[PDB]
Amino acid sequence: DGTLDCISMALTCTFNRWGTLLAVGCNDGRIVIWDFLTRGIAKIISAHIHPVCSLCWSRDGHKLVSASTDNIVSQWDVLSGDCDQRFRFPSPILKVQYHPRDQNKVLVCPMKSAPVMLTLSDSKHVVLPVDDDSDLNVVASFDRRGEYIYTGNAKGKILVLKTDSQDLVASFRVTTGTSNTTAIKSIEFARKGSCFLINTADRIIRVYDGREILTCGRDGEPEPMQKLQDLVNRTPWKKCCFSGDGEYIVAGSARQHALYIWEKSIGNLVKILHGTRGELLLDVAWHPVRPIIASISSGVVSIWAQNQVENWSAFKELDENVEYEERESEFDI
Amino acid sequence: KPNYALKFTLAGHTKAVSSVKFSPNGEWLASSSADKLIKIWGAYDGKFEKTISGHKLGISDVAWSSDSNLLVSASDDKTLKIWDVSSGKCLKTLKGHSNYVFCCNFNPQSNLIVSGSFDESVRIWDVKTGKCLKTLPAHSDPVSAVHFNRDGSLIVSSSYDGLCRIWDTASGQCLKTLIDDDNPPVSFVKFSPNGKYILAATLDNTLKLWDYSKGKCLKTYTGHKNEKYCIFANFSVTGGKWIVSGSEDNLVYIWNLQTKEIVQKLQGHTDVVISTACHPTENIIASAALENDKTIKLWKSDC
Amino acid sequence: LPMPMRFRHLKKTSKEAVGVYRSPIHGRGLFCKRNIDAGEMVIEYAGIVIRSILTDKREKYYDSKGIGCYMFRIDDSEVVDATMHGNAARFINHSCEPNCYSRVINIDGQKHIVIFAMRKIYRGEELTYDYKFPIEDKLPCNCGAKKCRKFLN
């Protein structure tokens, strides 16, 4: 539905705060900041020699946190492209995430170690707690306002901490239905409201409302707002994301390189988008204020927009025949 | 009511002037003409700054950049040309219009250009690469005037076929089509400063202010004479709220904005007052007339 | 397949099956965007369903407004007038050799004038049918057909 030839080795992308720019990582380890309106590249940053697998914009948009595969995280000013700060860790980093309401702070999910929240002003770090002490794979994310931290382990356990004190404000383990746990693949939140989603190893996305987890307390049984899956193919989900408003949810079937689109309230599947059967789906993102969806597959990015009835359909356009309502004086002088 | 008096008379274009525009900082006055020449002049003293040539045919429109650093020139050579106002360098020459380009305007963020041509198609252009990003079979007649809204989300277009069409910028979607029960050749169109209204001139001695959210004409302005040429209209805001325009009777008409009543008639031009420009900051109005006058006159009032 | 089911399918696929472009026949016209099989529903000439007695009062009305009449006779009693309210079917040119043909169908009691395909129509083809306009005293035709009557009438 529209691709870009000007970028190669697309690996990970991230919309800015207003959905005007897109920073995509490349295998060479370069940042390609490409613009939507001019439909061209806005910037090229020599980030790492190692490909970049995690990228996040700052709220003001002037900072981008990038993670190399060399366990090298670095902050870059979008105007200049300089490495503002640079750090390295053990257990290679799985993800970075700016704090949405404090760009000085940034959480980092490493591979084998617990996620740690650092600051840029001071090169300090706060190691977030781990429930089972043996997960070795815990994804973590700020909420919409950056007030709480949601951490999900490979054993389905879900901890909600407060971002400042790291104190356990809520907890619950998700189930595979019967009695078993499932590897929490990812935690996503809505940029609007409080609904969030969890991708798990059961190939079943679970949509909740964080207020219900907060009122559920520690070690409770919160039910999901929704349960979403491909009941037909039972396909895993490499990457999923909400819509900009938060009423549409998309999942990327890397198994068959497709895109499933459900709703939030009803949860019925909006639609499906099919990509090149030969392409391996890698990354998925939604335009924050547009029905536009960016996909990264086999190093190539594709764009999926959604237009209205007009752009040619605007006499007064009607859809179905209209019986004329004759009047009393319809034949009168 | 205004009391605009002639302060400076400007001239030098060897041919018929087609457009005069005040720089957004109010520092310069750009005057385009069919002589393939543009003339930058001092906006407060009538001091001729320089002449910028390079266009191959007559120039039908010119538009300033928001930072008062660039000028787009739409010429009859089917080309646009983006110039640095400080150096006069042809930074870009926009090719792709299949016929005479008549109007041109920058986006509110000055990074994009809209262009109307005789080809009856509106082209949407990059600035930093000068690349045509969109092209729309907008009208069934040569385009007269194109303009941006307050932010750059909407593009209004007028043409000789009498249609005033509002189009989406991000998609080229023909949002609205304003009709006034007839087919009056619309020679000029532009958004309101608040982006809420639209001023369109029709070639029947009539100006019309429409509501965008309502899609209906709110006010009408007559008394002038305009039936053949692209006579520009501007909003006088630095003093009282007025509507200033040229007329085929060598007059410079100024109506009240709300009451639609003529508040001044600036006479002194000998030919049709072909182009008008209102100062962005001061109560200064540049009125340029056609070849039988070849003069541009600065008018300053006290309100 | 049921005429109602076929009609629902036609109204679902009409927006993406056909388009309107610059036409070498005349001005703008209907072109095929996806290969259309013979006899299948191409497009409804949708519009305002009126009675016949009200045609003239409308026509003269348009004659007073200088707006062209877009009317097709459903039958001796009804007419689809698309002058003010219609669909893309108002841009179907005519050819003496049509790959399409108009037929009136009855869905749930209401009559619909549907242009179906006289033959297997392929993508890009301009859609044309037989208007069957009665012989007047003359509109030249530029349909390009070798059998062209040189005149619709």
UniProtKB/Swiss-Prot annotation, chain A:
Acidic residues composition bias: residue spans: 323-333
Function of the protein: In embryonic stem (ES) cells, plays a crucial role in the differentiation potential, particularly along the neural lineage, regulating gene induction and H3 'Lys-4' methylation at key developmental loci, including that mediated by retinoic acid. Does not affect ES cell self-renewal. Component or associated component of some histone methyltransferase complexes which regulates transcription through recruitment of those complexes to gene promoters. As part of the MLL1/MLL complex, involved in mono-, di- and trimethylation at 'Lys-4' of histone H3.
Reported tissue expression: Ubiquitously expressed.
Chief localisation class: nucleus
Modified residues (Phosphothreonine): 235
Name of protein: Retinoblastoma-binding protein 5
Keyword set includes Ubl conjugation: yes
Lineage start: Eukaryota, Metazoa, Chordata, Craniata, Vertebrata
Recorded superkingdom: Eukaryota
Residues of the full protein shown: 18 to 354 of 538
Swiss-Prot record, chain B:
Effect of residue 232 to W: Strongly reduced affinity for histone H3
Record localization: Nucleus
One CC-aspect GO term: MLL1 complex
Marked site positions, Important for interaction with histone H3: 76, 102, 232, 291
Phenotypic consequence of residue 102 to D: Strongly reduced affinity for histone H3
GO biological process entries: gluconeogenesis; negative regulation of transcription by RNA polymerase II; positive regulation of DNA-templated transcription; positive regulation of gluconeogenesis; regulation of cell cycle; regulation of cell division; regulation of DNA-templated transcription; regulation of embryonic development
Chain positions with N6-acetyllysine modification: 81
Impact after mutating residue 258 to A: Reduced interaction with RBBP5 and reduced ability to stimulate KMT2A methyltransferase activity in association with RBBP5 and ASH2L
SUPFAM superfamilies: WD40 repeat-like
Repeat (WD) residue spans along the chain: 12-51, 54-95, 97-137, 138-177, 181-222, 225-265, 268-302
Keyword field contains Repeat: yes
Outcome (variant: residue 194 to A): Loss of interaction with RBBP5 and reduced ability to stimulate KMT2A methyltransferase activity in association with RBBP5 and ASH2L
Cited CDD domains: WD40
One Pfam match: Beta-prop_WDR5
Record PANTHER family: WD REPEAT-CONTAINING PROTEIN 5, WD40 REPEAT PROTEIN
Protein name: WD repeat-containing protein 5
Taxonomic classification: Eukaryota, Metazoa, Chordata, Craniata, Vertebrata
Gene that this sequence comes from: WDR5
UniProtKB/Swiss-Prot annotation, chain C:
Residues engaged in binding Zn(2+): 96, 141, 143, 148
Outcome reported for the amino acid change (mutating residue 45 to F): Slightly affects methyltransferase activity toward unmodified or monomethylated H3K4me
Stated consequence of mutating residue 58 to A: Slightly affects methyltransferase activity of the enzyme alone, while it impairs methyltransferase activity in complex
Signal peptide limits: none
Result when mutating residue 59 to A: Does not affect methyltransferase activity of the enzyme alone or in complex
Residues covered by the SET domain: 16-132
Mutagenesis / variant outcome for changing residue 45 to A: Impairs methyltransferase activity toward unmodified or monomethylated H3K4me
Cellular compartments annotated: Nucleus
Impact when changing residue 65 to A: Affects methyltransferase activity of the enzyme alone, while it does not affect methyltransferase activity in complex
Name of the protein described by the UniProt record: MLL cleavage product C180
Interval of the full protein contained in this chain: 3814 to 3969 of 3969
